[PDB]
Amino acid sequence: SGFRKMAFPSGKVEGCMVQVTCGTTTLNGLWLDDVVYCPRHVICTSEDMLNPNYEDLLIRKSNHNFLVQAGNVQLRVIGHSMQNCVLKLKVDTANPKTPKYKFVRIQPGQTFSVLACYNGSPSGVYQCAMRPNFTIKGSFLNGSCGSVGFNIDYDCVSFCYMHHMELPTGVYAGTDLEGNFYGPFVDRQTAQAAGTDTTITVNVLAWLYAAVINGDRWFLNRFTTTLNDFNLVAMKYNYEPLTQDHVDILGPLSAQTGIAVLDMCASLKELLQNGMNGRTILGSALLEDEFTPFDVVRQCSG
Amino acid sequence: SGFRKMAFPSGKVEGCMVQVTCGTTTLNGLWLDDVVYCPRHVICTSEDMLNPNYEDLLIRKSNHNFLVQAGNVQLRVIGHSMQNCVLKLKVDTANPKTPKYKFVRIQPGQTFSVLACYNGSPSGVYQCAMRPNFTIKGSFLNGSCGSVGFNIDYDCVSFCYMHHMELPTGVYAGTDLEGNFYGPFVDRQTAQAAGTDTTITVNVLAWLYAAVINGDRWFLNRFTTTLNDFNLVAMKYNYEPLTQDHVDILGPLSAQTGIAVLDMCASLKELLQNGMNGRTILGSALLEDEFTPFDVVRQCS
Lengths: 302, 301
Ligand SMILES: *[C@](O)(C(=O)NCc1ccccc1)[C@H](C[C@@H]1CCNC1=O)NC(=O)[C@H](CC1CC1)n1cccc(NC(=O)OC(C)(C)C)c1=O
Ligand SMILES: *[C@](O)(C(=O)NCc1ccccc1)[C@H](C[C@@H]1CCNC1=O)NC(=O)[C@H](CC1CC1)n1cccc(NC(=O)OC(C)(C)C)c1=O
Ligand SMILES: [Cl-]
Description:
- The structure is a homodimer.
- Chain A is α+β, with helices and mostly antiparallel strands and 302 residues long.
- Among the domains of chain A are: 15-91, Trypsin-like serine proteases (Thrombin, subunit H), CATH 2.40.10; 201-301, Orthogonal Bundle (main proteinase (3clpro) structure, domain 3).
- Chain A is 23% helix and 28% strand.
- Chain A has a 7-stranded antiparallel sheet with strand order 5-4-1-2-3-7-6, with no helix packed on it. In chain A, strands 8, 9, 10, 11, 12, 13 and 14 form a 7-stranded mixed sheet that branches.
- The longest helix of chain A is centred in the C-terminal third of the chain and has 14 residues, at 261-274.
- The two termini of chain A are 18 Å apart.
- The A-B interface holds A 1-12, 14-15, 115-116, 122-126, 137-141, 166, 170, 214, 283-286, 299-300 and B 1-12, 14-15, 115-116, 122-128, 137-139, 169-172, 214, 283-286, 299, 301.
- The structure holds the ligand *[C@](O)(C(=O)NCc1ccccc1)[C@H](C[C@@H]1CCNC1=O)NC(=O)[C@H](CC1CC1)n1cccc(NC(=O)OC(C)(C)C)c1=O (2 copies) and chloride ion (CL).
- One copy of the ligand *[C@](O)(C(=O)NCc1ccccc1)[C@H](C[C@@H]1CCNC1=O)NC(=O)[C@H](CC1CC1)n1cccc(NC(=O)OC(C)(C)C)c1=O binds at residues 26-27, 41, 49, 140-145, 164-168, 170, 172, 187-189 of chain B.
- The PDB classes it as antiviral protein.
- Keywords: Mpro mutations main protease SARS-CoV-2, antiviral protein.
- The assembly is dimeric.
- Chains A, B are 3C-like proteinase nsp5.
- The organism of A, B is Severe acute respiratory syndrome coronavirus 2.
């Protein structure tokens, strides 16, 4: 068996998805209390998209321009307000299904679940990671914009992503729910590129810990390296630097397996230099970097 | 861009999961209308597992022996029946969150989502396939039994799997929602084992057509093949025989790309010969067999 990518159950977020229409632009909105959050580029007409001025484009629009649909119910808009790259629409009706939630901003390497929606209607959910180059590997088609990413901790939904655009190489970019982009992108029709991605070293080590715990142990060795020595080799193969923070965060998985992080690094050094040498780890021929230490401690240990 | 491993939104299933307790044994149940479906082995002690006589263990139970909990609300058992390896508990309260649903028995190679649950609490959603040896790959632990697999096509929930047990290789076995096992397995702790696992050939081809529609052609070649000559090679790599049905099934992905399915088979043959040479297809450096022809058409427009 493969140690599978697990998404959070999505039901708490499903009850929050509405359709937002502004002329001929239709995409997804997040309905929490009496406010609908959606990408501000729903106001853009197509000619505007080239070089838009959003502040003067919003003054121009008025409440009745925004058609909001929760299933077969029309929400009446009674307010609009911009916040960075998200549009907040005040509606007449609070969402009776509003879960406990906060807005958070995740760091690169951290994972979250995405609820892909089209026309305010949820389509699918999958687990992914904020890449070091602030993009996400995924699958979004036309009408996917306004789709959100989140973590669940007890009954509390942490919303961390709103989807905005596709890049070259079929990867994706969006904002937190306060409308701030992840990575050096802007909401215009313009030539934009992710630029060189790196592997998430701390996640790879976590996934080697997950492997050891599920009995896959062939890559272990007698050697231990050091941070400076490991980072020399990491830097070479396009691997995020490993910091003393990373070592500390892996501490639990270290003590639960008797494999000191710097021993496992020696293992990883040897997999980067010599390759997989014919074998697999948890059924994968590549080193997986989209499981965090927390993910591995959750799904596995617990 | 877009052809990645996606589960269905789990919300319609989350509102059905409950906890079922009999003695010291607690597992998950599925609450649709006024019935709770769960694995019948809920009525077994750690001891009865080797040779349980289910009819004998069940005749000795009363409705009040079954503690069913929908979060904090205790449901009242007012009836009980056994269908194959599933226990059906009648309760006094219909589930008001019951979606539109049906029970379906799937064929090996079919995909579905699994809502993994512990103690009636959903933990996670993941997408998988009925392997050809009628097992499932993933991660269920102590607590996961009675977790269910489903598809959601246009608001109708099709329940096709309920989790029962783990087999020595760390693969998983279970039943349809009528309590009939997928495969030749029994709800019993006797050393049984899975037939050898083969690659779902029709699914890999679907995925090669997916890579082409997404604008990736590096693996294509000038050759075609006979069906018979393709299976003679593919069996040598432990690939499932391809049938006329698989070829009929792939028709629309062929027509859409103008690559005949026997020309795609020719590519796969060479992929099997050569490996990837450090290249990747839609992001993976192994051939992906848990995406069906139907899954490809749905995630393409
Ligand atoms: C988003 O705006 C959206 O879904 N809008 C509604 C809609 C659009 C089109 C047709 C019907 C309905 C989309 C989502 C994109 C499109 C396909 N995959 C996605 O994830 N985002 C954009 O269209 C986005 C808007 C920009 C930020 C303001 N955009 C515009 C122009 C170009 C691109 N990218 C692009 O062309 O990507 C490559 C890979 C270069 C082809 C883009 O995402
Ligand atoms: C299922 O009943 C369950 O979820 N257990 C409830 C529970 C236990 C402990 C505490 C709280 C709640 C389990 C699920 C299994 C076990 C671990 N992984 C799984 O997917 N089902 C069984 O344990 C099952 C019951 C048998 C069919 C009637 N069973 C019993 C005994 C042995 C095994 N298999 C086993 O030992 O697996 C190997 C791979 C050999 C370790 C088994 O599945
Ligand atoms: Cl892989």
